[PDB]
Amino acid sequence: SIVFASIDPRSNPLQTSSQNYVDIPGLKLDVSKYSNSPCLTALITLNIPTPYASGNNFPGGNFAIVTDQGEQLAYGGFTYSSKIPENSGRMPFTLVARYSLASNVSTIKAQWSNIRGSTVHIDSYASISAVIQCN
Amino acid sequence: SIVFASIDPRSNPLQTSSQNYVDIPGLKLDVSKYSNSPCLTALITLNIPTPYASGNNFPGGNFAIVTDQGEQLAYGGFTYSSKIPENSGRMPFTLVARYSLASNVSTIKAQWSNIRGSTVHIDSYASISAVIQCNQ
Amino acid sequence: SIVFASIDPRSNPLQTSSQNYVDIPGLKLDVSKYSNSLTALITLNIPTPYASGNNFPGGNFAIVTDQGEQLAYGGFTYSSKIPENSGRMPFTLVARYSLASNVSTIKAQWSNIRGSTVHIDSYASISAVIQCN
Amino acid sequence: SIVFASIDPRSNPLQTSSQNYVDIPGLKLDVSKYSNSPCLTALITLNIPTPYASGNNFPGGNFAIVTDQGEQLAYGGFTYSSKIPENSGRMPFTLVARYSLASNVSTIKAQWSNIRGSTVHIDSYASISAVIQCN
Amino acid sequence: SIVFASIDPRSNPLQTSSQNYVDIPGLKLDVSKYSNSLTALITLNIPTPYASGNNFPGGNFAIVTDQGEQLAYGGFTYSSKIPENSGRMPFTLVARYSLASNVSTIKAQWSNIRGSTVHIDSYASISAVIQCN
Amino acid sequence: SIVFASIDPRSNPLQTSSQNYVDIPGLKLDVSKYSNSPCLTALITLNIPTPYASGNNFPGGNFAIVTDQGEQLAYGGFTYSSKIPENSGRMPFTLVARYSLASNVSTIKAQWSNIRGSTVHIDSYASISAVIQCNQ
Numbered sequence A, D: 001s002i003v004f005a006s007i008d009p010r011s012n013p014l015q016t017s018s019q020n021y022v023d024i025p026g027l028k029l030d031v032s033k034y035s036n037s038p039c040l041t042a043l044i045t046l047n048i049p050t051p052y053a054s055g056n057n058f059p060g061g062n063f064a065i066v067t068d069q070g071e072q073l074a075y076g077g078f079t080y081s082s083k084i085p086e087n088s089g090r091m092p093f094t095l096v097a098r099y100s101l102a103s104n105v106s107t108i109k110a111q112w113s114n115i116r117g118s119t120v121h122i123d124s125y126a127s128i129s130a131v132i133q134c135n
Numbered sequence B, F: 001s002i003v004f005a006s007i008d009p010r011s012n013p014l015q016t017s018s019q020n021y022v023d024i025p026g027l028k029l030d031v032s033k034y035s036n037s038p039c040l041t042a043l044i045t046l047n048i049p050t051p052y053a054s055g056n057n058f059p060g061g062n063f064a065i066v067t068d069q070g071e072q073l074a075y076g077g078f079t080y081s082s083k084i085p086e087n088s089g090r091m092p093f094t095l096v097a098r099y100s101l102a103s104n105v106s107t108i109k110a111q112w113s114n115i116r117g118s119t120v121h122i123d124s125y126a127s128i129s130a131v132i133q134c135n136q
Numbered sequence C, E: 001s002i003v004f005a006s007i008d009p010r011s012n013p014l015q016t017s018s019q020n021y022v023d024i025p026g027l028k029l030d031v032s033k034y035s036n037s038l039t040a041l042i043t044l045n046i047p048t049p050y051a052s053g054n055n056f057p058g059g060n061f062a063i064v065t066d067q068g069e070q071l072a073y074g075g076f077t078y079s080s081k082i083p084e085n086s087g088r089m090p091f092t093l094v095a096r097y098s099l100a101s102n103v104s105t106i107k108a109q110w111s112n113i114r115g116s117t118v119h120i121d122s123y124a125s126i127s128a129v130i131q132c133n
């Protein structure tokens, strides 16, 4: 089966300047109905196709897929090559994780953080999804 | 099930300077066998791993996943951080969409458009794909 | 079904200056059980690579079978000749493979460009969804 | 998925002389977790491989598959050819039904009744099962 | 997936005295959508038939494709030459079919034995479970 | 998935007068590819549509579905209602069992045995089959 959530914050853009991972609002999958099932596995894809980061010390952004119990299943990020980009461009990002559904996990969700004091921004479509299958 | 289409236009590269979204040639999925299936969902992934854009005003490219009825299911894009890039680099791009097959749609396809007068280029492998699963 | 492999080479980063495609260690899927049948949709996710060099550096990646069949390839490059500090350029590649053949392994490979060195020092994955046609 | 129940009343045989359909104890499938699902269908098989009926007026037995709301999805039965069988033999019986799981149905179960005043008997293995699939 | 058909011919019972297999009306499965692919496991359920006659009567049943392929057959007969009142003899038959071919329909057929007349006057079904190998 | 085996021994009919259960030749399912699969269940159907039994003391036949480790998953049988049937009629028989594949078993097979000194006969099509499904 497929589980899916998307956001499109074009009229209310999101941002963070957090050095620690924090939730991206709306990018959460409710997997409660599949919880406590050792024979099920989720393949999760976080797709943030048009992010950017502003700043003056090689700005960038990090992203993670995490459970409601705070377990980090995957992480990665983008950065610019110049210390002070002329105009911080859009740097597509995708991340793929796997999770067994044996535990009482309720939610699988996206998080983000900054780098070198940047501000990360999302102002357009992004999604989190999973394919759930038997082992 | 899996539906898949790829291109590899190395000998006859593709480009667009269209301001409006137009089809990327060859990146279409035929889902007609699954049309009006109320219990099925498609997770669609557009993978353009090696595009670039030429131009002189912070060039880039936009991409979308669209039905044959013109419904835009997802969109996004890349841009460079310099006004006039020294040598427009390859900027990998992936886009993921969801589509309920409770519809009379026959085709899902990839679209692209330019930004600030750029030209977008594909000269190598790219794909569009879907995983089609029962909701239960 | 789902097949999956990941790496996270923080304490011993991976690098290549190979002009020809070479395996990325740890990013291999065993599809043994499904050979001679089914289609696999394969996603290579390298979310945080970079490449060092002084001539428009970048990195190429491929998904290959043990039969030597290149199913997909692509790469990233920088827009400057000599990047100030080669940035992280997220990369994802998606391939398909019919499991009608005698394939056992589907794996990731990488290569350099213009004499670069490609680097992975954090999480990356390869995965497949295997389904009936 | 498969749902399954069996009985083996070798040490506590079951019988009925009811002219109206009544439940066969233990031959019930709980389909609660699949209820209220218009996209799911059950294919149900009732297998009573070794029944017999006693009596003196062409004895036999009837069986049905029914929902907890009393909807009869299938029926059939066996009978002997002689008015007074010398020793009522075992007459294997199987019945197959289909049910959409759109409704709030909880249970799918077996029932039995007599014919011409017989007594129907089960004293060995019998089962009810279903294959549940998406439409 | 499940394909299913049933009949319940109480107000207009069905009968045959045909020595050759003939279709039982209403007991046909449309497998159109699955041709040229998958296996079907097909169950014919005739829970309450009987046969009239005076020379060890009985009835035969088969599962057949529209290509004329007999996938399974079997039948019931009585142990007495002239049954006092031909009793109900439950019948089930199970077949398999690979859907690699161009088949559209899988259906039930029946025939008599030793000049009997076979009868169905109550519920009966044909069904299939269609699955990937 | 489906696993299936059939026989049709018209030219070389099968019989048993064994008091103890023995294998019905040819009616075996190989489930070795599915062994030790904790999340899978098999629904097994033994279909013997046209057996008969000869004998002179209320003859009949017994049938079972058994694993290769000797575990009897289901059983049942037919018998005639007369001591000495005039002409032992064909008595259709079907048996359904469940088997969890959380086991190292490799084969599921059909078995038969006699009753009251009968001989059981199969001279025509018969099958054993399983539908194998994930529990979820």
Ligand SMILES: C[C@@H]1O[C@@H](O[C@@H]2[C@@H](O[C@H]3O[C@H](CO)[C@H](O)[C@H](O)[C@H]3O)[C@@H](O)[C@@H](CO)O[C@H]2O)[C@@H](O)[C@H](O)[C@@H]1O
Binding pocket: A050, A052, A087, A088, A089, A090, A123, A124, B058, B060, B076, B077, B078, B079, B080, B115
């Ligand atoms: C910061 C700056 O953002 C982008 O330029 C914006 C432009 O953004 C639109 O296009 C991008 C794709 O490039 C995304 O879809 C955004 O969500 C869109 O809104 C607009 O916001 C206009 C105002 O209408 O302002 C421009 O500056 C981007 O093109 C630049 O490269 C850069 O990242």
Ligand SMILES: C[C@@H]1O[C@@H](O[C@@H]2[C@@H](O[C@H]3O[C@H](CO)[C@H](O)[C@H](O)[C@H]3O)[C@@H](O)[C@@H](CO)O[C@H]2O)[C@@H](O)[C@H](O)[C@@H]1O
Binding pocket: A058, A060, A076, A077, A078, A079, A080, A115, C048, C050, C085, C086, C087, C088, C121, C122
């Ligand atoms: C080459 C350089 O690499 C990154 O800066 C590193 C920094 O890397 C961490 O952060 C990135 C995300 O940007 C990845 O998660 C790495 O796996 C991390 O290790 C650290 O390694 C520090 C150690 O002092 O060195 C920095 O240079 C990146 O942020 C830069 O933009 C650039 O790509």
Ligand SMILES: C[C@@H]1O[C@@H](O[C@@H]2[C@@H](O[C@H]3O[C@H](CO)[C@H](O)[C@H](O)[C@H]3O)[C@@H](O)[C@@H](CO)O[C@H]2O)[C@@H](O)[C@H](O)[C@@H]1O
Binding pocket: D050, D052, D087, D088, D089, D090, D123, D124, F058, F060, F076, F077, F078, F079, F080, F115
């Ligand atoms: C009424 C009578 O029942 C059977 O004879 C029983 C015999 O039954 C066993 O065998 C049948 C299969 O024929 C079933 O598995 C029963 O559950 C078994 O118990 C035994 O009960 C013995 C005592 O041990 O008594 C016999 O009369 C059957 O064989 C007859 O044909 C008839 O239906």
Ligand SMILES: C[C@@H]1O[C@@H](O[C@@H]2[C@@H](O[C@H]3O[C@H](CO)[C@H](O)[C@H](O)[C@H]3O)[C@@H](O)[C@@H](CO)O[C@H]2O)[C@@H](O)[C@H](O)[C@@H]1O
Binding pocket: D058, D060, D076, D077, D078, D079, D080, D115, E048, E050, E085, E086, E087, E088, E121, E122
């Ligand atoms: C030929 C005769 O048929 C049956 O007796 C019928 C009786 O049939 C009903 O019951 C059977 C189950 O035994 C089926 O459900 C039929 O569909 C029913 O109709 C009735 O039709 C009455 C009408 O007066 O006639 C009887 O003869 C059966 O019970 C006999 O054993 C025998 O096989």
Ligand SMILES: OC[C@H]1O[C@H](O)[C@H](O)[C@@H](O)[C@H]1O
Binding pocket: B050, B090, B123, B124, C058, C074, C075, C076, C077, C113
């Ligand atoms: O940088 C990667 C790039 O390398 C060469 O230019 C190829 O012709 C392109 O299609 C692309 O593969």
Ligand SMILES: OC[C@H]1O[C@H](O)[C@H](O)[C@@H](O)[C@H]1O
Binding pocket: E058, E074, E075, E076, E077, E113, F050, F090, F123, F124
């Ligand atoms: O009564 C049915 C019966 O008919 C003939 O005797 C056949 O040889 C048997 O195999 C069986 O099909």
Ligand SMILES: C[C@@H]1O[C@@H](O)[C@@H](O)[C@H](O)[C@@H]1O
Binding pocket: B052, B087, B088, B089, B090, C056, C058, C077, C078, C113
């Ligand atoms: C247009 C050019 O295409 C290939 O040569 C890449 O290696 C370069 O980085 C640039 O994108």
Ligand SMILES: C[C@@H]1O[C@@H](O)[C@@H](O)[C@H](O)[C@@H]1O
Binding pocket: E056, E058, E077, E078, E113, F052, F087, F088, F089, F090
């Ligand atoms: C042994 C005999 O076999 C076939 O000829 C049947 O038609 C008979 O009814 C009997 O079972």
